[PDB]
C-alpha cells in the first residue's frame, strides 16, 4: 500500500516485496565523475528503481506511485513529471485526485516551475478552471508576489475568460499592499484585455486613482511607473494638465520619482514642438543635473546620458 | 570617503515609507538595516575598509564542487550541466586554469547528458531541455578544445530546436513543455554559437519576444507578465543575437533597468518593489552593455565613452561587502547561504561592473585592491569574449546542417 516519502515507516524500494522482481538500474556518471552528487541512500534507491521502470516503459500502478517519491525528492526532475503524465493517461487515473495532489505539492514548493506546469496540464485535460482563482488566491495570501502564481492566474483568466471579478481582486490586494508591483501589473493586464485604455472615462478613472495613491504614498515607485506606463503610449506631452498638477504636488509630496517624471514630460514636449522650447529644455537640463548630483545619484550616468541626449536633439 | 556606500550623505538613501507600512516596506527596511550593519562594520571595528575579493576561498569552493557535491545538492540532480557551467564560468572569471584531464572529464560527462535526438538533459539519460542545452554548450565553449566542440551533435541539435519551435515564433522549453522568453534566448544562444541558424528557424521569434515587453519597459516571461530582470536579459540578449533589438522600445527598457539599481544597497532588484539580490548583478547590469551596443549601432551620439549607465562603483561595493561568504562562494544577500548559481552571477556582474568597452574606448573601474580585477565576460553569452570568438570561428568552418 501507499507510503509517504516522509512517513516514519517508509522503507527503501530494495526492501519492498512488490518490487523484488525488477533489478534497479544505477546511474552511469562515467569512470571520472564531475559535479557528482553524493545522493542519500533514500534518493539513490528511488532513482535506481525509476530508471528501471522508465527503461522498460512499465505503465503500471506501482510505477505511478514511484514517480510521486521521485518528484518529492527532486520536484525539478521534468523527466519524472513527463513519465507521471504518461501514466496518468495510460492508467486512466482520477484527475481530481491528481488535482488534490498537485494542490498539496504546490503549497509545499510554490516557486518550482514543474508543479505549476503540471497543474496547467490537469486544468486543460479536465477543462475545469472552477478551483483555480481560489487556489491561486491562497498561494498569493502566503507570498503576494509569487511569479508562477500570477502567471498561472493570467493563463486561467485568458484561457477560460474569467475577467469579471479580477479588478475587484486587484483592488483588494492594492488595499493590503499598494507597493505590490505584481498587482499593479495585474491591474494593467485586466484593463488592457477588457475595456482598454483608449476609453477616456477608464483612462481618467485610472489616472485619478493612481494620483490619489501617489498622494498617500509619494515614494511608492509602482504607482509612478503605472501612471507613466498608461500615458506614455500616446506620449506624455499629449496631456497638458499633467505637468502643472505634478508641480502642484511637488512642495509637499516631492520625491526623485516626481522630478524624474517631470524630465520625461519635458523630453516628450521637446520632441513634439512645444511652446517656449528654450525654457522647457533649460528646465529639463536643470532637473537632470539635480538628479545626477543630489536627488538620484545612483542613476547619475543615466541622468547625464539624458542631459546629453536633450542637448544633442536640440543642436 | 573613497567608498560611495560609506559616505555620510549615503544615510539619506534609506527608505522613506511615508509613514504607511506595508509588507513590501517592512521587508525592504529589514534588508536595509542588515546592509547598513555590514557597511558600518569597518567604522565599528576601527579598521580601514579593505575590499578584497576572496579569490582563494572562492577557488577552493569551486574546484571541490566541480568534482563532488553533498546530498544537500539533490535538488540539482536535473541541473548538472548548469553546475558545470556555473563552476567553469566562475573559474574562468577568476583566471583559474582548467586542467586538461578535468576538461576531458567534463566533455565525457556532457556527452552522457546529450540526447540521441538532439540537445542535452539535466543529467545522464534525462530527456533534453533547452536550459541544460544552453548550459552544456556554454560549458563546452568555455573548455574550447576540439574535443569539447566535437561533443555537440549539430545536426540533431538543429532538429531538436525545430521540434520546439512554435508557429507564433516562440519555443517550448522541452517537448510537452511550456513557452517563455528564456527558451528563445537558449535557442538563439546555442544556434548562433554552433552555426546552425537556417533562414526560418527564428521566423517570428523577435516579434514574439517584443510582445513580452510591458508597460513598465522591461520584459516578462510571457506576454502580460510583470517585468523581470532574468527574462529581460534573455529577451534583449536573444534580440541582439538575431540583430532585432529595434523590435523593443529601448528607451523605456533603459529607464526600467536603471531604476532597478537600489539607491541604498547598490545592488539590483529583479522587479520593482522587490528586494536586492546578488544574482541580478548579472541579469540587470548585463543589460546596460547590451543597450549601449544597441544604441551605438543606431548612431546614438550621447553615449558615455568610459562607463556603463549604472553606478558601477556602488554595484562592486554591494558584491564585495555583502555577497561574499567567508568560507568561499557568493550569495544573494547577507544572511543567505552560498550556492554555485549566486557564485556564477555575482562574479559575472562584478566583471561587467569593472570593464567598460565600446568601439576603440576601454575603461576599467576596479574597486578595492587591484587584485580584484576579473577576466571579462561577453554580455550576450556570459562566457569569456575569447571563448565566444573561438567557438564561433570554429563552427563557422562547418556548413549549416541540412534536414534528414
Ligand atoms: C539553482 C537551481 N536550484 N534548483 C532547485 C534548480 C532547479 C535550479 C536551476 O537549475 N536553475 C535555476 C533556475 N533557472 C531558470 C533559468 N533558466 C535559464 C536559461 C537561460 C538563461 C537564464 C535562465 N534562468 C534564470 C532566470 C532567467 C529565471 C533568472 C535554471 C537553472
Ligand atoms: C519565476 C521567477 C524567476 C520568479 C522570481 O523569483 P523570486 O520571487 O524568488 O525572486 P525576485 O523576488 O527577485 O523576483
Ligand atoms: Mg517542464
Ligand atoms: Zn538571486
> Minimal CA–CA distance to B69: which of A13, A112, A29, A50?
A29
Q: Does A314 reach chain B within 8 Å, measured CB to CB?
A: no
Written in H, E and C, the secondary structure of chain A is CCCCCCCCCCCCHHHCHHHCCCCCCCCCCCCCCCCEECCCHHHHHHHHHHHHHHHHCCCCHHHHHHHHHHHHHCCCCHHHHHHHHHHHHHCCCCHHHHHHHHHHHHHHCCCCHHHHHHHHHHHHHHCCCCCHHHHHHHHHHHCCCCHHHHHHHHHHHHHHCCCCCHHHHHHHHHHHCCCCHHHHHHHHHHHHHCCCCCCHHHHHHHHHHHHHHHHHCCCCHHHHHHHHHHHCCCCHHHCHHHHHHHHHHHHHHCCHHHHHHHHHHHHHHHHCCCCCHHHHHHHHHHHHHHHHHHHCHHHHHHHHHHHHHHHHHHC
Residues in chain B: 404
User: Active-site positions of A?
Assistant: 111
Are B160 and B119 contacting, i.e. CB atoms less than 8 angstroms apart?
A: yes
Are A144 and A176 contacting, i.e. CB atoms less than 8 angstroms apart?
A: yes
**Cβ contact (<8 Å) for A188 and B272?**
no
Binding-site residues from annotation of B for (2E,6E)-farnesyl diphosphate: 228-231, 271-274, 280-283
Closest alpha carbon within chain A to B261: A298
> Minimal CA–CA distance to A87: which of A100, A76, A98, A77?
A98
Q: Does A48 reach chain B within 8 Å, measured CB to CB?
A: no
Ligand with smallest separation from the Cα of B339 = 1
Ligand with smallest separation from the Cα of B183 = 1
Rounded (5°) CA angle A61-A64-A68: 140
Please list, in sequence order, all residues whose beta carbon lies within 8 angstroms of the beta carbon of residue A153, skipping any fewer than 6 positions away: A132, A133, A136, A140, A186
Sort out which chain A residues have CB atoms less than 8 A from B266's CB and list them. Answer: 298
**Cβ contact (<8 Å) for B125 and A120?**
no
Best mutation site among A117, A144, A145, A147 for ligand 2 pocket (most ligand atoms within 8 Å of CB): A147
Please list, in sequence order, all residues whose beta carbon lies within 8 angstroms of the beta carbon of residue B68, skipping any fewer than 6 positions away: A33, A35, A36, A37, A38
* Nearest CB neighbour to B67, from listed A34, A120, A193: A34
Q: In 3-state terms, what secondary structure has residue B261?
A: strand
**Cβ contact (<8 Å) for B77 and A189?**
no
Catalytic annotation on B58?
A: no
Please list, in sequence order, all residues whose beta carbon lies within 8 angstroms of the beta carbon of residue B78, skipping any fewer than 6 positions away: A74, A76, A77, A78, A79, B121, B122, B123, B126, B132
Grid coordinates representing A280 are: 522647457
Please state whether beta strands B355-358 and B361-364 pair in parallel, antiparallel, or not at all (unpaired): antiparallel
Catalytic residue among B279, B323, B344, B346: B279
Are A144 and A183 contacting, i.e. CB atoms less than 8 angstroms apart?
A: yes
Phi-psi region of B346 (alpha: psi -120 to 50; beta: other; left: phi over 0): alpha
**Cβ contact (<8 Å) for A188 and B121?**
no
Ligand 2 center to residue B384 CA distance, Å? Answer: 27
DSSP letter at B354?
H
Residue reference for cell 485568458: A158
DSSP letter at B221?
S
**Max CA distance (Å), chain A:** 89
CA distances from A22 to A13, A18, A63, A81, A265 (A): 10, 9, 11, 21, 72
Catalytic residue among B212, B260, B318, B332: B332
**C-alpha torsion sign, points B257, B259, B265, B271:** negative
Ligand 2 center to residue A201 CA distance, Å? Answer: 35
Q: Give the gap in angstroms from C-alpha B59 to the nearest C-alpha of chain A.
A: 15
What is the C-alpha to C-alpha distance for residues A218 and A246, in angstroms, rounded to an integer? 11
Grid coordinates representing A69 are: 517519491
> Minimal CA–CA distance to B400: which of B237, B202, B209?
B202
Q: In 3-state terms, what secondary structure has residue B237?
A: helix
What is the C-alpha to C-alpha distance for residues A168 and A156, in angstroms, rounded to an integer? 17
Question: A 232-261 residues with CB below 8 A of B?
Answer: 232, 255
What is the C-alpha to C-alpha distance for residues B319 and B66, in angstroms, rounded to an integer? 23
Please list, in sequence order, all residues whose beta carbon lies within 8 angstroms of the beta carbon of residue A288, skipping any fewer than 6 positions away: A263, A303, A304, A306, A307, A310
Q: Does A76 reach chain B within 8 Å, measured CB to CB?
A: yes
Q: Give the gap in angstroms from C-alpha A55 to the nearest C-alpha of chain B.
A: 10
Best of A116, A298, A307, A314 to mutate (most B CBs within 10 Å, chain B): A298
Ligand 4 center to residue A145 CA distance, Å? Answer: 15
Phi, psi of B364 (to 5 degrees): -105, 145
**What is the CB < 6 Å shell around ligand 2?**
A 111, 147-148; B 230, 270-271, 274, 277
Q: Does B365 reach chain A within 8 Å, measured CB to CB?
A: no
Question: B 163-192 residues with CB below 8 A of A?
Answer: 174, 176-178
Binding-site residues from annotation of B: 228-231, 271-274, 277, 279-283, 342
Please state whether beta strands B355-358 and B68-69 pair in parallel, antiparallel, or not at all (unpaired): unpaired
Q: Whose CA is nearest to atom 8 of ligand 2?
A: A146
Q: Give the gap in angstroms from C-alpha B266 to the nearest C-alpha of chain A.
A: 8
**Cβ contact (<8 Å) for A33 and B109?**
yes
Q: Within 13 Å of residue B395, how many CA atoms lie on the same side as its CB? A: 27
Tally of domains in chain B = 1
What is the C-alpha to C-alpha distance for residues B265 and B262, in angstroms, rounded to an integer? 5
B185 lines ligand 1 (CB under 6 A): yes
Within 10 angstroms of residue A93's Cβ, the number of other Cβ atoms is: 15
Q: Does B42 reach chain A within 8 Å, measured CB to CB?
A: no
Q: At what angle do helices A78-90 and A41-56 cross, to 10 degrees?
A: 50
B283 lines ligand 1 (CB under 6 A): yes
> Minimal CA–CA distance to B191: which of B175, B180, B206, B202?
B202
What is the C-alpha to C-alpha distance for residues B75 and A76, in angstroms, rounded to an integer? 7
Best of A37, A84, A308 to mutate (most B CBs within 10 Å, chain B): A37
Q: Where are the alpha helices (DSSP H) in B46-145?
A: 55-67, 80-93, 100-113, 130-143
Grid coordinates representing B152 are: 555537440
Catalytic residue among B342, B355, B387, B394: B342
Q: At what angle do helices A166-176 and A181-193 cross, to 10 degrees?
A: 160
The DSSP H or E segment spanning B352 is helix B340-354
Closest alpha carbon within chain A to B23: A177
Within 10 angstroms of residue A108's Cβ, the number of other Cβ atoms is: 10
Q: Which domain holds residue B380?
A: 1-404
Question: A 206-235 residues with CB below 8 A of B?
Answer: 216-222, 225-226, 229-230, 232
Are B270 and B276 contacting, i.e. CB atoms less than 8 angstroms apart?
A: no
Are B77 and A44 contacting, i.e. CB atoms less than 8 angstroms apart?
A: no
Are A296 and A303 contacting, i.e. CB atoms less than 8 angstroms apart?
A: yes
Are B266 and B328 contacting, i.e. CB atoms less than 8 angstroms apart?
A: no
Ligand with smallest separation from the Cα of B332 = 4
Within 10 angstroms of residue A265's Cβ, the number of other Cβ atoms is: 25
Q: Does B299 reach chain A within 8 Å, measured CB to CB?
A: no
Question: B 102-121 residues with CB below 8 A of A?
Answer: 102, 104-106, 108-109, 112, 121
Exposed, middle or buried: residue B1 (CB in 10 Å: 0-12, 13-18, 19+)?
Answer: exposed
Please list, in sequence order, all residues whose beta carbon lies within 8 angstroms of the beta carbon of residue B301, skipping any fewer than 6 positions away: A312
Give bridge partners of residue A42 from the DSSP assignment. Answer: none
Q: Does A188 reach chain B within 8 Å, measured CB to CB?
A: yes
**Cβ contact (<8 Å) for A301 and B308?**
yes
What is the C-alpha to C-alpha distance for residues B403 and B173, in angstroms, rounded to an integer? 22
Best of A35, A150, A285 to mutate (most B CBs within 10 Å, chain B): A35
What is the C-alpha to C-alpha distance for residues B139 and B190, in angstroms, rounded to an integer? 11
Ligand with smallest separation from the Cα of A117 = 3
Q: Give the gap in angstroms from C-alpha A67 to the nearest C-alpha of chain B.
A: 14
Amino acid at each position: 500500500g501507499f507510503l509517504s516519502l516522509d512517513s516514519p515507516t517508509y522503507v527503501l524500494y530494495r526492501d519492498r516485496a512488490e518490487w523484488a522482481d525488477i533489478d534497479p538500474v544505477p546511474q552511469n556518471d562515467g569512470p571520472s565523475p564531475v559535479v557528482q552528487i553524493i545522493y542519500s541512500e533514500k534518493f539513490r534507491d528511488v532513482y535506481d528503481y525509476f530508471r528501471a521502470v522508465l527503461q522498460r516503459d512499465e505503465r503500471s500502478e506501482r510505477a505511478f506511485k514511484l514517480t510521486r517519491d521521485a518528484i518529492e525528492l527532486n520536484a525539478a526532475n521534468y523527466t519524472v513529471w513527463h513519465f507521471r503524465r504518461v501514466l496518468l493517461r495510460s492508467l486512466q487515473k482520477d484527475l481530481q485526485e491528481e488535482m488534490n495532489y498537485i494542490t498539496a505539492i504546490i503549497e509545499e514548493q510554490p516557486k518550482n516551475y514543474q508543479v505549476w506546469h503540471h497543474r496547467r496540464v490537469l486544468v486543460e485535460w479536465l477543462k475545469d478552471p472552477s478551483q483555480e482563482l481560489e487556489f491561486i488566491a491562497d498561494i498569493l495570501n502566503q507570498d503576494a508576489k509569487n511569479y508562477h502564481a500570477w502567471q498561472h492566474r493570467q493563463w486561467v483568466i485568458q484561457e477560460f475568460r474569467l475577467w469579471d471579478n479580477e479588478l475587484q481582486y486587484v483592488d483588494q490586494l492594492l488595499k493590503e499592499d499598494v507597493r505590490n508591483n505584481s498587482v499593479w501589473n495585474q491591474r494593467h493586464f485586466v484593463i488592457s484585455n477588457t475595456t482598454g485604455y483608449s476609453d477616456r472615462a477608464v483612462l481618467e478613472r485610472e489616472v485619478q486613482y493612481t494620483l490619489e495613491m501617489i498622494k498617500l504614498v509619494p515614494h511608492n515607485e509602482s504607482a509612478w511607473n503605472y501612471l507613466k506606463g498608461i500615458l506614455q503610449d500616446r506620449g506624455l506631452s499629449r496631456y497638458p494638465n499633467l505637468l502643472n498638477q505634478l508641480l502642484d504636488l511637488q512642495p509637499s509630496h516631492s520625491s526623485p520619482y516626481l522630478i524624474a517624471f517631470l524630465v520625461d514630460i519635458y523630453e516628450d514636449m521637446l520632441e513634439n514642438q512645444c511652446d517656449n522650447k528654450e525654457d522647457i529644455l533649460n528646465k529639463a537640463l536643470e532637473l537632470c543635473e539635480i538628479l545626477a548630483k543630489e536627488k538620484d545619484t545612483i542613476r547619475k550616468e543615466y541622468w547625464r546620458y539624458i542631459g546629453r541626449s536633450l542637448q544633442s536633439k536640440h543642436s | 570617503e573613497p567608498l560611495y556606500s560609506l559616505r555620510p550623505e549615503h544615510a539619506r538613501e534609506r527608505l522613506q515609507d511615508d509613514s504607511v507600512e506595508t509588507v513590501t516596506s517592512i521587508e525592504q527596511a529589514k534588508v536595509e538595516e542588515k546592509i547598513q550593519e555590514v557597511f558600518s562594520s569597518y567604522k565599528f571595528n576601527h579598521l580601514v575598509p579593505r575590499l578584497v575579493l576572496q579569490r582563494e576561498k572562492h577557488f577552493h569552493y569551486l574546484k571541490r564542487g566541480l568534482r563532488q557535491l553533498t546530498d544537500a545538492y539533490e535538488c540539482l540532480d536535473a541541473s548538472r550541466p548548469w553546475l558545470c557551467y556555473w563552476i567553469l564560468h566562475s573559474l574562468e572569471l577568476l583566471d583559474e586554469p582548467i586542467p586538461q584531464i578535468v576538461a576531458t572529464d567534463v566533455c565525457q560527462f556532457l556527452e552522457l547528458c546529450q540526447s540521441p535526438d538532439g540537445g542535452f538533459g539535466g543529467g545522464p539519460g534525462q530527456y533534453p531541455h533547452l536550459a541544460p542545452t544552453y548550459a552544456a554548450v556554454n560549458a563546452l565553449c568555455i573548455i574550447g578544445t576540439e574535443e569539447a566542440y566535437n561533443v555537440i551533435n549539430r545536426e540533431k541539435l538543429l532538429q531538436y530546436l525545430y521540434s520546439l519551435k512554435q508557429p507564433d515564433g516562440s519555443f517550448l522549453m522541452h517537448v510537452g513543455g511550456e513557452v517563455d522568453v528564456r527558451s528563445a534566448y537558449c535557442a538563439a544562444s546555442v544556434a548562433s554559437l554552433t552555426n546552425i541558424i537556417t533562414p526560418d528557424l527564428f521566423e517570428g521569434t523577435a516579434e514574439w519576444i517584443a510582445r513580452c515587453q510591458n508597460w513598465e519597459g522591461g520584459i516578462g516571461g510571457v506576454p502580460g507578465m510583470e517585468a523581470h530582470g532574468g527574462y529581460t536579459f534573455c529577451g534583449l540578449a536573444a534580440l541582439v543575437i538575431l540583430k532585432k533589438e529595434r523590435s523593443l522600445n529601448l528607451k523605456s527598457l533603459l529607464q526600467w533597468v536603471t531604476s532597478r539599481q537600489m539607491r541604498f544597497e547598490g545592488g539590483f532588484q529583479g522587479r520593482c518593489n522587490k528586494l536586492v539580490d546578488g544574482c541580478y548583478s548579472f541579469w540587470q547590469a548585463g543589460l546596460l552593455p547590451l543597450l549601449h551596443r544597441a544604441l551605438h549601432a543606431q548612431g546614438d551620439p550621447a553615449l558615455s565613452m568610459s562607463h556603463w549607465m549604472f553606478h558601477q562603483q556602488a554595484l562592486q561595493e554591494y558584491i564585495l561587502m555583502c555577497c561574499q561568504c567567508p568560507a568561499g562562494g557568493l550569495l544573494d544577500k547577507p544572511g543567505k547561504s552560498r550556492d554555485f548559481y549566486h557564485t556564477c552571477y555575482c562574479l559575472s556582474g562584478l566583471s561587467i561592473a569593472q570593464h567598460f568597452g565600446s568601439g576603440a574606448m576601454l575603461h576599467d573601474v576596479v574597486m578595492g585592491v587591484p587584485e580584484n580585477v576579473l577576466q571579462p565576460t561577453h554580455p550576450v553569452y556570459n562566457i569569456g569574449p575569447d571563448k565566444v570568438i573561438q567557438a564561433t570561428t570554429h563552427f563557422l568552418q562547418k556548413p549549416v546542417p541540412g534536414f534528414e
